[PDB]
Design an enzyme around this catalytic site. Structure first.
Site, PDB file in Angstrom:
ATOM      1  N   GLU A   1      -3.073  -4.535  -3.192  1.00 23.50           N
ATOM      2  CA  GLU A   1      -3.570  -5.090  -4.456  1.00 23.50           C
ATOM      3  C   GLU A   1      -3.731  -4.205  -5.405  1.00 23.50           C
ATOM      4  OE1 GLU A   1      -5.069  -4.522  -1.179  1.00 23.50           O
ATOM      5  OE2 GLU A   1      -6.852  -5.787  -1.050  1.00 23.50           O
TER       6      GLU A   1
ATOM      7  N   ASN B   1       0.928  -1.118   0.141  1.00 21.46           N
ATOM      8  CA  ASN B   1       0.033   0.141  -0.025  1.00 21.46           C
ATOM      9  C   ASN B   1       0.959   1.429   0.036  1.00 21.46           C
ATOM     10  OD1 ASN B   1       0.573  -0.882   2.755  1.00 21.46           O
ATOM     11  ND2 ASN B   1      -0.644   0.451   3.573  1.00 21.46           N
ATOM     12  N   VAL B   2       0.300   2.294  -0.736  1.00 22.15           N
ATOM     13  CA  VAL B   2       1.076   3.443  -0.647  1.00 22.15           C
ATOM     14  C   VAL B   2      -0.006   4.645  -0.244  1.00 22.15           C
ATOM     15  CG1 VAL B   2       2.148   5.157  -2.135  1.00 22.15           C
ATOM     16  CG2 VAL B   2       2.633   2.796  -2.656  1.00 22.15           C
ATOM     17  N   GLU B   3       0.345   5.297   0.639  1.00 22.79           N
ATOM     18  CA  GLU B   3      -0.504   6.387   1.500  1.00 22.79           C
ATOM     19  C   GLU B   3      -0.049   7.662   0.798  1.00 22.79           C
ATOM     20  OE1 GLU B   3      -0.664   5.623   5.703  1.00 22.79           O
ATOM     21  OE2 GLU B   3      -1.920   4.084   5.456  1.00 22.79           O
TER      22      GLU B   3
ATOM     23  N   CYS C   1     -10.682  -2.385  -4.155  1.00 28.37           N
ATOM     24  CA  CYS C   1      -9.591  -3.234  -4.668  1.00 28.37           C
ATOM     25  C   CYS C   1     -10.598  -4.515  -5.497  1.00 28.37           C
ATOM     26  CB  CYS C   1      -8.782  -3.936  -3.821  1.00 28.37           C
ATOM     27  SG  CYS C   1      -7.593  -2.848  -3.328  1.00 28.37           S
TER      28      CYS C   1
HETATM   29 ZN   LIG Z   1      -8.025  -1.834  -1.241  1.00 29.65          ZN
END
Ligand SMILES: [Zn+2]
Ligand SMILES: [Zn+2]
Ligand SMILES: [Zn+2]
Ligand SMILES: [Zn+2]
Lengths: 141, 140, 134, 139
Positions: free
Chosen positions: A62, A49-51, A98
């Protein structure tokens, strides 16, 4: 225990998902998620994940994994997806954003393996199970 | 244009962005966009737009390119970005969503080169110019 | 603010400040308020709404725009005020909101940004905030 | 009877509100209009329509537009039912994954979501729990 996938491959996929978490950029929630995808050519791709300061801009593990697969030329035929997150007890299930993304490229029976942070808890569900009555190109005209 | 970046590298970036459009998944709008990013150690990553039946789930080329960079472990120091799209005359501009995403990883002087569909023309702007007084961590 | 009567600007700033009470932000705890003046001189307000999935978060600016649009005002907005949860810094719209606003307003559309108390203010046009808009 | 916990009159009123909400849609890119109606615990009805943007990523579905309306009106929970209707005539309009994740943030697992086609010919009722199992939600 996921049909159509060798035990060694599945073991490898899970290892890849746990390790993918290290690529996470999450200075806001500090919640890391990793994801691995096995292509029809038996190649493994990973994502995290990339915030962003603006929360609407966050990209889940995903979607990161899928972007990698698609940019590499693998349009379809994916065999399995493993998702792992910093959840101590419960398994990390893909969010609706996702699921909608995955639905665009896989078949209804596509297997999605969800694990907790260590893999001491796991669950397997198909694309069809996670997103019933999926909204698709058929709704457009 | 584009200081701190050799002309050889800029040229290579331009062609990569041009060719990146071939990776696009846009069966809906049919509009293709390609993006290339040069890392600090001069490695080039590329990305293309990915659409979805649900418009909300679309990923621009600039973001697909940045995902590629980040997943390769390059979380800082990018040198330049080139965007090229299926726009006959005018140079394709990065949308606000992508500007906010880019702003999270680059300095204000970061150069963004925008090309027309053929790459015969371009326009250069810095991150700071494209997203003035940007919402950042300092606010949080 | 050019073309904005002072009674409208003052009312707008006040509406923005109190709008942050409608905020749903149990994740960031960051409350943001926004108000928009229609060509009709009617004020609409919005607040940020967060979600377990950060991708689903809707900013205050967008909540306010949804309200205006659902009321049937698809053009002619006159001004927008944003009140952030930042004590000593004026809150600026994120790139996502700038792109959303750009869809409905003119380049000279004024966007007023205030700190959490309203003691500090900064004004910028749509065109200045999102140059060469896509 | 069609939907449990919801009176036949209320529902009827919901389907009409959803179909009419379609006219408020801003969709110059897909040209696909969607309307949505929500019944609060207070028995009040709110509506919403989809709003598109040049940058597709910025689009907001009708479901989310209606929920923003409700939430900004002070109804943080206890919603009774949701009706969704789109321009697609040959099939009901089901909420995309984005909207399911949003709705899941404020309603109980048995929350009924009624999906209709462009006219009202076809329809289908499903609960929040069925539409998004193993939901990554507040709980
Ligand atoms: Zn998601
Ligand atoms: Zn973009
Ligand atoms: Zn915003
Ligand atoms: Zn939706």
């Amino acid at each position: 225990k996921v049909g159509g996938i060798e035990d060694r491959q599945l073991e490898a996929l899970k290892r890849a998902a746990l390790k993918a978490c290290e690529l996470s950029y999450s200075p806001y929630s500090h919640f890391r998620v990793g994801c691995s995808i096995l292509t029809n050519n038996d190649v493994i791709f990973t994502g995290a994940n990339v915030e962003n300061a603006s929360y609407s801009n966050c990209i889940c593990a995903e979607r990161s994994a899928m972007i990698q697969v698609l940019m590499a030329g693998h349009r379809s035929g994916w065999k399995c997806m493993v998702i792992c997150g910093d959840s101590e007890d419960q398994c990390v299930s893909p969010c609706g954003v996702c699921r909608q993304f995955i639905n665009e490229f896989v078949v209804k029976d596509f297997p999605i393996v969800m694990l907790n942070s260590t893999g001491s808890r796991s669950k397997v569900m198909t694309m069809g199970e996670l997103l019933p009555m999926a909204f698709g190109p058929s709704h457009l005209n």
